[PDB]
Design a protein around this ligand. Structure first.
Ligand SMILES: Nc1nc2c(ncn2[C@@H]2O[C@H](COP(=O)(O)OP(=O)(O)NP(=O)(O)O)[C@@H](O)[C@H]2O)c(=O)[nH]1
Ligand SMILES: [Mg+2]
Ligand SMILES: [Mg+2]
Length: 177
């Protein structure tokens, strides 16, 4: 069984790192903005054997006209924000859902909060407190998931691996149904 996954979301919100930790076990050393990229992951869910094509896309506006070339015939979308960036969550209904809904109107969406390891990070909390902000709360992520009609809401850390497996298990289930 082959299924296609496309990952989207604000620049630097952790998309590439999430695909790599899942499919190569290594955590990339240098932050390099994505143009486009492809990876493959073999996953097994409910005794079903699945070869998941992972289509990585650009968060940078520089590449907005390129990103839609990745959408044909998608089976599941991972729509991401970073827990260290409340504005990246605000941009989910502003830009990511409108775009996905247009190109892939009925494809299931998993809303994914990345960088969970930064929720309790002192530097992050101090930096955001300067703007009278704080890390995204799980309740806020889950509210947004409901608002946009996502299949599910998941949090993870590519850095520590917490929750990564479950994101891809959920995405595969979604892709199969
Ligand atoms: N603390 C922490 N940092 C992370 C995590 N995942 C990625 N990062 C860091 O965040 C930066 C951007 O990550 P990356 O995956 O490249 O982001 P992206 O969403 O693919 N960006 P683009 O849209 O530009 O391709 C990198 O410096 C990376 O090390 C995570 O789980 N925790
Ligand atoms: Mg990237
Ligand atoms: Mg915005």
């Amino acid at each position: 069984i082959r299924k296609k996954l496309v990952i989207v979301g604000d620049g630097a919100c952790g998309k590439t790192c999430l695909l790599i930790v899942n499919s190569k076990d290594q955590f990339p050393e240098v932050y390099v903005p994505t143009v486009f990229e492809n990876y493959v992951a073999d996953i097994e869910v409910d005794g079903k054997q699945v070869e998941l094509a992972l289509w990585d896309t650009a968060g940078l506006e520089d590449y907005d006209r390129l990103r839609p070339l990745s959408y044909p015939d998608t089976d599941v979308i991972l729509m991401c924000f970073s827990i260290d960036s409340p504005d990246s969550l605000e941009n989910i209904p502003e830009k990511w859902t409108p775009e996905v809904k247009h190109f892939c109107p009925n494809v299931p969406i998993i809303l994914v909060g990345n960088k969970k390891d930064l929720r309790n990070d002192e530097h992050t909390r101090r930096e955001l407190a300067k703007m009278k902000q704080e890390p995204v709360k799980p309740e806020e992520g889950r509210d947004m998931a409901n608002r946009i009609g996502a299949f599910g809401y998941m949090e993870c850390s590519a850095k520590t691996k917490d929750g990564v497996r479950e994101v891809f298990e959920m995405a595969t289930r979604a892709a199969l149904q």
